[PDB]
Design a protein around this ligand. Structure first.
Ligand code: ZN
Ligand code: ZN
Ligand code: ZN
Ligand code: ZN
Lengths: 339, 341
């Protein structure tokens, strides 16, 4: 079948190849893939930032139809719509997996990175680890919630935001557009959206953002303070790949505020220690979400509380999409369509 | 009334002056001070690092006997031993005061910075804010618990360490000493102490620390990973001022571990984003704590689970102490003794 894979010399791009899948194991399932979104993490994978993965099928925003199941499978049946996510399989038994924190499993398998992901006509999944897409959720939309959605939904839970609090999102990209949507429609936060791209801000404003701020036109930190009463926001979710966004996020928090890093720029950030010490502010990383996080995240999509902004593309287009993402030209997600 | 005050041109030193206090309002009390510890913060206020505070009485590690009470005061009576701490008074009604996080009050008054403190024979206090010192606690130890004590105690609370978890303390002297005592003796953590000074390490070993690591001689992060079974510690308290100590703390955290800074880095701290995200770590810091945190911190002192290193000096020696502290010659606290008898 046709698959997008990491190059023999990783350079940031995909090779399109014919691949034959091995036979399924007894707790596994075989999918006819329907859709796979392109996430910034695929690009980091393809670029070799996390080591050489030449030949690995990319993609961890996959939606597919179950074509075949192993003998031991009781959780899925043929014809089930399931997902292929960054969190592909955990060991099930470690302190992380057992305490509700399965993404941090040290023996984790990650789709499109340490195991063939979903950007191919067909994929193998471990059955009990492939979350069903609920009935009333459009498959193209489900593709975005599979990474972009569960990621930001979980990071907003990690931020400690309660309804009525001010929350700032740095980045209105595929990730940050959804973060906005969850923040406003699910968690009841008041939302500020910060980006360099006016067209993305404009869209932000239509899907939830209470206030938009272009950070090439003003100092976001100053403006954020003005908006909030002079203190700053309760939380900041960083969905921007720029160093400065992380640092502007920290300085924009009111005392006891929480910064949650979601974006993976290959970058260090400066940490204002006097800010954590005197103003009691917290900094934390959040990593996709558990199987339960994703189910909850799908369910809000199915209910229409979030509506991922999506456009379909052809597999042969993966490299055009990669350059488009690098150029910041993308609203929402581009989704590879295998139908 | 003899008082130590910020000089007219703040120069890092104190003037010793005669001061006559105003009358006390109805919700306040007047104290006869027994003890006031000399803190690194007093040296910063005196230097003008925080703005020009000329004439302000210094000191936020005070312990004193209530001498007089305002007409509205029910919480204290003449003869009570109470404290004069960094957190001197909050507004009582803002989001921070009422949610249980009063230290962050935007109208906070701090002893020895924005209000006269406890480094004088006498102090005014707002009676409801002067936490009582429990009867089994040595008053001189109490002076130090009001700052270093509550600080390290509340930091360990925000770390989330639970009994049986590994915690690493970076920097074995100063704050670290008290931090090691709370973590082992109060919270039931397994404790690693990291420092460059073997003397300090051997002492810390004496007061509970399970593993000591000379960071002068080996990479701490590597030994810590080995100690803990490969992953790292659940949390790290940073009590050292060297930047490398912060970088090692974060790098030594198991996933979802939390670093709590109690000191400030000499050069800006950096974090690696991809690691923060893939390992889900957390970095915070803590300074002093609420009146309740202070009460609990005092109480563990009174049960004899923590014991700060303290020594007494005369008010007259205040500038000598400041010189000792810049020369880095003081283990624990020098505490100004006002008492007779
Ligand atoms: Zn992703
Ligand atoms: Zn596991
Ligand atoms: Zn102090
Ligand atoms: Zn207040």
């Amino acid at each position: 079948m046709k698959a997008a894979v990491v190059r023999h010399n990783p350079d940031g791009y995909a090779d399109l190849v014919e691949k034959e899948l091995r036979a399924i194991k007894p707790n596994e399932a075989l999918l006819d893939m329907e859709y796979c979104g392109v996430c910034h993490t695929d690009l980091h994978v393809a670029a070799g930032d996390y080591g050489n993965k030449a030949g690995t099928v990319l993609g961890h925003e996959g939606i597919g139809i179950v074509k075949e199941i192993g003998a031991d499978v009781s959780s899925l049946q043929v014809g089930d719509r399931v997902s292929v996510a960054w969190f592909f399989e955990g060991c099930g038994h470690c302190e992380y997996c057992v305490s509700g924190n399965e993404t941090f499993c040290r023996e984790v398998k990650n789709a499109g990175y340490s195991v063939d992901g979903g950007m191919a006509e067909e994929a193998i999944v471990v059955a009990d680890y492939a979350v069903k897409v609920p009935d009333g959720l459009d498959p193209i939309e489900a593709s975005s919630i599979t990474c972009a959605g569960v990621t930001t939904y979980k990071a907003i839970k990690v931020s400690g935001v309660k309804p009525g609090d001010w929350q700032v999102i740095f980045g209105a990209g595929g990730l940050g557009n959804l973060a906005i949507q969850y923040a406003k429609n699910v968690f009841g936060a008041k939302v500020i959206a910060v980006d360099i791209n006016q067209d993305k801000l404009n869209l932000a404003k239509k899907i939830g953002a209470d206030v938009i701020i272009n950070s090439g036109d003003v100092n976001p930190v100053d403006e954020i303070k003005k908006i909030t009463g002079g203190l700053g926001v309760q939380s900041a979710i960083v969905c921007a790949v720029a160093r400065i966004a992380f640092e502007q996020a920290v300085a924009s928090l009111k005392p006891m505020g929480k910064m949650v890093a979601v974006a993976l720029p290959n970058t260090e950030m400066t940490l204002s220690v006097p800010t954590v010490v005197f103003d009691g502010v917290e900094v934390a990383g959040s990593l996709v979400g558990t199987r339960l996080d994703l189910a909850e995240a799908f369910q809000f999509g199915a209910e229409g509380k979030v509506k991922p902004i999506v456009a379909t593309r052809k597999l042969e287009e993966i490299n055009d999409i990669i350059d488009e993402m690098k150029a910041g030209k993308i609203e929402g997600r581009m989704v590879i369509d295998f139908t």
